């Protein structure tokens, strides 16, 4: 609507058979864990999801056991918290959305699990929004708890700008510039919204090779069985 | 049902075995001319409605934009 | 010409050649295809 359609970026997965850069997904998961997890939730992504992807079973294991998870009231009606398991999902920031409303000045930070899929031109939007907290121009004035992000609908996103250059340090050491961080978290959120991106593209490559083998051969069989007629010569011979 | 379909008489229909004839006789030899022959018998009936759909679509888009564009004279 | 007379003329053998070939084709296709995908990404 009334917002800049985020400019497309030359993503490493933008191509037709181009997979995701898994180091960028690992860095973006670190960005989410250290910055984005304070307000946003990832209800459909368990720690196991990380396993095999930018993280191993044991890698995720330590990551899962860094946090604590209430494991129910056990058998003594005793709600109790335990270190996370590879089967545990990502922890909630808030127990219910009304606590999110109370803690975020009436705004609800949405599930970031499918944000890229749920936002038109998500990957771009995400990058743009996170990197689009420009100053409101003359004539527009925003109330407290609002920020002029041209890309955000209305240009008034409650979320304050969360990525200040060198906000967090990448374990890999890649300079943590605001952008390098926004690109990594956009790749990660993308991965989140489609953990199968890579596997699929492989299927699609096998499908293109199989169809390139099979279409001319089936066409040749059809043209064999239809040549007979396509050569049929009709002649009218009235006895006259 | 094949048989007792209609009355056909005094006609001779010749044909050849599939394996005896080339699979793609002059496929691009005459195929291209024919496809082109075909396109020129149907292009004037088919294309100009979609041409004016393209003009109406663009027009609508641009007109809509102008509609959205602020009236400079207004607010001044 | 020999092949036709040997594995493609008797329908039973036709099926045999098809099945056996398919059994191996998967190995080859998967291998070759994977090579390509990996090279691409």
């Amino acid at each position: 609507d009334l917002e800049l359609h985020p400019p497309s970026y030359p993503w490493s997965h933008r191509g037709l058979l181009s997979s995701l850069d898994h180091t960028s997904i690992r860095r973006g998961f670190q960005v989410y864990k250290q910055v984005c997890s304070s307000c946003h939730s990832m209800d459909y992504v368990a720690y196991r999801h990380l396993v095999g992807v930018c993280y191993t079973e044991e890698e995720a294991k330590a990551l899962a056991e860094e946090v604590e998870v209430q494991d129910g009231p056990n058998d003594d009606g005793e709600m109790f918290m335990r270190p996370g398991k590879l089967s545990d999902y990502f922890p909630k920031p808030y127990p219910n959305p009304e606590a999110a409303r109370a803690a975020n000045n009436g705004a609800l930070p949405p599930d970031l699990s499918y944000i890229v899929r749920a936002r038109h031109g998500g990957e771009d939007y995400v990058f743009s929004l996170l990197t689009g907290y420009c100053e409101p121009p003359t004539g527009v004035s925003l109330r407290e708890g609002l920020y002029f992000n041209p890309y955000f609908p209305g240009q008034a996103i409650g979320m304050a700008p969360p990525i200040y250059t060198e906000v967090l340090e990448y374990d890999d050491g890649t300079p943590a510039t605001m952008s390098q961080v926004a690109k990594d978290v956009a790749t990660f959120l993308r991965w989140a919204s489609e953990p199968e991106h890579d596997h699929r593209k492989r299927m699609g490559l096998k499908m293109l090779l199989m169809m390139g083998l099979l279409l001319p051969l089936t066409y040749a069989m059809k043209r064999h069985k239809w040549s007979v007629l396509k050569s049929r010569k009709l002649a009218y011979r009235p006895p006259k | 049902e094949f048989g007792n379909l209609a009355r056909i008489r005094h006609v001779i229909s010749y044909s050849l075995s599939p394996f005896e004839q080339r699979a793609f006789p002059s496929y691009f030899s005459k195929g291209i001319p024919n496809v082109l022959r075909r396109t020129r018998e149907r292009i004037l009936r088919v294309a100009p409605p979609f041409v004016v759909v393209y003009l109406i679509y663009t027009w609508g888009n641009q007109e809509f934009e102008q509609s959205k564009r602020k009236n400079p004279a207004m607010y001044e | 010409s020999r092949l036709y007379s040997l594995l493609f003329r008797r329908t039973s053998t036709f099926a045999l050649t098809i099945a056996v070939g398919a059994l191996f084709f998967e190995r080859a296709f998967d291998q070759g295809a994977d090579a390509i995908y990996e090279h691409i990404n």
């Binding site: 002649a235 | 050849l16 004839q21 | -």
Partner: peptide
């Protein structure tokens, strides 16, 4: 009789002799 008329040549369509049949 019918003998008067002759079979049209399909050579144009006709491709390349039992020797060849096996291959064909």
């Amino acid at each position: 009789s019918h003998t008067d008329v002759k079979v049209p040549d399909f050579s144009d369509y006709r491709r390349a002799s039992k020797e060849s049949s096996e291959a064909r």
